[PDB]
A paper describes a structure:
In crystals II and III, three protomers of GD structure were determined, which showed the clear electron densities of PLP-bound alanine, PLP, and Schiff-base linkage bonds. The persulfide group was removed from substrate cysteine and transferred to Cys356. When we superimposed the ToCDS GD structure into the ToCDS NAT structure, the conformations of the PLP pyridine ring and His114 of both structures were well conserved. However, no tilting of the PLP pyridine ring and His114 was observed in ToCDS. The dihedral angle between the PLP pyridine ring and Schiff-base linkage bond with Lys216 (internal dihedral angle) in the ToCDS GD structure got wider than that in the ToCDS NAT structure by almost 20°. The dihedral angle between the PLP pyridine ring and the Schiff-base linkage with alanine (external dihedral angle) was found to be narrower than the inner dihedral angle. Two amino groups of Lys216 and product alanine had the similar distances of approximate 2.9 Å with the hydroxyl group in an equilateral triangle form. The internal dihedral angle of ToCDS changed from 45° in the NAT structure to 66° in the GD structure on average. In our understanding, the steric hindrance from the incoming substrate amino group of cysteine pushed away the Schiff-base linkage amino group of Lys216 without tilting the PLP pyridine ring due to the tight binding. In the GD structure, the distance between the alanine amino group and the alanine-attached PLP carbon atom decreased as the substrate approached the PLP keeping the same external dihedral angle.
Sulfur, essential to many biomolecules such as sulfur-containing amino acids and cofactors including iron-sulfur cluster, is usually mobilized from cysteine by the pyridoxal 5′-phosphate- (PLP-) dependent enzyme of cysteine desulfurase (CDS). We determined the crystal structures of CDS from Thermococcus onnurineus NA1 (ToCDS), which include native internal aldimine (NAT), gem-diamine (GD) with alanine, internal aldimine structure with existing alanine (IAA), and internal aldimine with persulfide-bound Cys356 (PSF) structures. ToCDS belongs to class II CDS based on the primary and tertiary structures and showed the highest similarity with EcSufS. ToCDS is a PLP-dependent enzyme and the crystallographic snapshots of catalytic intermediates of ToCDS showed the conserved dihedral angle rotation of Schiff-base linkage relative to the PLP pyridine ring as shown in EcNifS_CsdB and XometC, which implies the PLP-dependent catalytic mechanism of ToCDS is well conserved.
Numbering used by the authors:
A (entry chain B): -2 to 398
B (entry chain A): 2 to 398
Write the structure that this text describes.
């Protein structure tokens, strides 16, 4: 929408960008000043709880919290009522397992990918172990490319399919639209972990054939910490059983029992993170002013240069060689050095990078490595930063071992 | 300095008379500045990275957890961050759900906020348990002799420290001694006590304790606490698991890590925990003693002014047992209407059932209007309240 120069105009709103080269955006994003200003105005100018209390402050907070839910719903192509606020993606996913637990029978089958983050693996493991389910992993290569033929066989008799949109370890962008169409043809519930897609590329629930979808405010959306989202497609309102219950979730309560209210309030127990939802809505508004298409483009350029530069240094990097299937994340290793050491040297030069397993241990074991070092980007990162990154990589790479 | 020196830090204080503190508190500038510093100067995820931003974030996050532990007399590792009291309470029910057998007994009070009632109701329903209520009066002072009777066979006792509808301060020390004496696990809902009066887990004999940053502690929204006494680390099943929760993981198995990370699934509300820690620091600069005295002084004046006006108020007549909350009703007028006219005068009050329908149904009322305080509220505010209240009751001829 807005006429902005990328990345110069985003950088102007983010003071830390003058201090460091921030390449750890898959862990969490830097926060623009206008997102913190939107939260600061709730705290200082209209501080109150919601649930439509008659007083003016509650009226204004409530109106802002509702606005925030709608902004989020539009961003995803969802209806207002299908959006539920959690603390993070992890909560959202656990809520899907706990909320659907009751519909599984011994011998049922959950299928996922072998690349999942622990948060999109552990709930399904625990649930499988407890109810005697089968948990099967669709097959794929070491770059993260899934065998879609194997996907069709695995999904066939599946009760539920849970997949990440993008891998936080490898940067592979899975073909979630195709996987969703398969799940639909086979009558399997489809859950998408969009923790690394939201705010970096397009995420639309109807395009993705999603039944549930989860993402985290603090990542691509450029919101604060402490705010997540769980999309619950309306088809499921009659079966999903709210895992958290109490204030705000009812029509009536007596000492003998209770009656739940309509969604979305049905799923939101107690005072919500009002400030976080306002912040996330400002994050989303900020993203839409830049445009998801231009964000993707800017990340693809950074990925292209970084990658070409590491080939020149003969530094192996992971994930798909086809850049059309590679998000703004480049995991790499320097043979002869431990990832933690590479990240430490990079930190002494003011370049922030992550090292280790990335909460994706099955990725590291599949590939047969201890960790990787990971550089991740966002729209505010620059080609200039990548050049200076390559410059220190170059120096670092000198000497044997 | 009290309350002027606190009011200097809250701009809203110059725009309205905020008497809706039990719903949520107003937030002082230093709380917001602390959260802004994280977002603008050391923004990063926690867990562990070598990079400097992550070192700082990790350090401040841990520091927050310590500040919260010390606030309530706990051990660093016994503090779990959640989104609010309601999540904390639900997590207690879900993580202990496995220890009950059909016919076991859960005991609570009859004045509970829905968040400290429904999880127990649900659990009793699904497990064939006995859910029983200790008796009390309309004020609502609990019958402690009845509590002995009821806690005897109990597997778990859940009580609120203070009622958000009546303002009654329960005798939690005593109820806690009883349940310990009877071998029951004691769970305390301190949503309305944290930040308004002393809450120490040792003194309270609590096994589990819950509170909300956004209320008395003058912290932000989205940050709750659950206290888990070290005794229960091997019984309590973490209801939410994944990132930051493990030691190892493979495609068909997982090993969980140690408290408190074992109970915190995914990227935590870093900015909230840091905001909460600065609210607790702000609270301590003032002192819980002074906060409680300031609020008692407002209740006492408010209450006598409403007697003078023939406006009935609920909860304990004994002010020693009455927190900083006064629920009342104007005869001839629905509470939502009293709240509107008060709002027209820039006085913020809450009306309705306050998510405590069993309180309303025990008293035989639809709801009440609720004026609630904090340390920054003033005597001059209470007087202006009583003035519009007077005009309001006069007009009703
Ligand atoms: C977040 N992963 C990062 C913390 C990282 O790798 O550095 C993530 C989640 C969990 O999101 P939370 O907000 O709950 O921490 C889930 N799925 C994926 C793919 C990622 O990256
Ligand atoms: C919070 N009650 C207020 C919203 C009000 O009475 O208006 C409360 C809870 C729930 O805490 P949350 O932060 O989850 O909403 C639980 N117990 C009590 C006693 C209160 O007041």
């Amino acid at each position: 929408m807005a006429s902005m120069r990328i990345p110069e105009d985003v950088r102007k709103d983010i003071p830390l960008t003058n201090e460091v080269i921030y390449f750890d955006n898959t862990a969490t994003s830097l926060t623009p000043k206008p997102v913190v200003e939107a939260m600061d105005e709730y705290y200082l100018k209209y501080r109150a709880n919601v649930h439509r209390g008659v007083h003016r402050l509650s009226q204004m907070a409530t109106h802002k919290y509702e606005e925030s839910r709608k902004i989020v719903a539009d961003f995803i192509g969802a209806k207002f009522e299908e959006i539920v606020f959690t603390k993070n993606t992890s909560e959202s996913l656990n809520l899907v397992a706990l909320g659907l637990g009751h519909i599984f029978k011994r011998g049922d089958k959950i299928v996922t990918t072998p690349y999942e983050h622990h948060s999109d693996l552990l709930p399904w493991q625990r649930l499988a172990t407890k109810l005697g389910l089968k948990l099967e992993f669709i097959e794929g290569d070491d770059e993260g490319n899934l065998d879609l033929s194997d996907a069709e066989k695995k999904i066939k008799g599946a009760k539920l399919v849970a997949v990440q949109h993008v891998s936080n370890a490898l940067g592979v962008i899975h073909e979630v639209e195709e996987l969703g169409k398969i799940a639909k043809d086979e009558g399997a519930i489809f859950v998408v972990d969009a923790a690394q897609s939201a705010g970096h590329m397009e995420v639309n629930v109807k395009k993705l054939h999603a039944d549930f979808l989860a993402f985290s405010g603090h990542k691509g959306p450029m919101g604060p910490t402490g705010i997540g989202v769980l999309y619950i497609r309306e088809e499921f309102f009659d079966t999903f059983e709210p895992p958290l219950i109490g204030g705000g979730t009812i029509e009536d309560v007596s000492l003998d029992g209770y009656k739940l209210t309509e969604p979305p309030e049905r799923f939101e127990a107690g005072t919500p993170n009002i400030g976080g939802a306002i912040g996330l809505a400002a994050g989303i508004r900020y993203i839409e002013r830049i445009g998801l298409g231009r964000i993707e483009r800017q990340e693809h350029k950074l990925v292209k240069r970084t990658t070409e530069g590491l080939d020149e240094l003969e530094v192996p990097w992971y994930g798909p060689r086809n850049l059309k299937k590679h998000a703004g994340v480049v995991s790499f290793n320097v043979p002869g050095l431990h990832p933690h050491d590479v990240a430490a040297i990079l930190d002494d030069h003011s370049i922030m990078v992550r090292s280790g397993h990335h909460c994706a241990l099955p990725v590291m074991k599949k590939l047969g490595i201890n960790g990787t070092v990971r550089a991740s980007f966002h729209v505010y990162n620059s080609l200039e930063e990548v050049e200076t990154f390559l410059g220190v990589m170059e120096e670092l790479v000198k000497g044997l071992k």
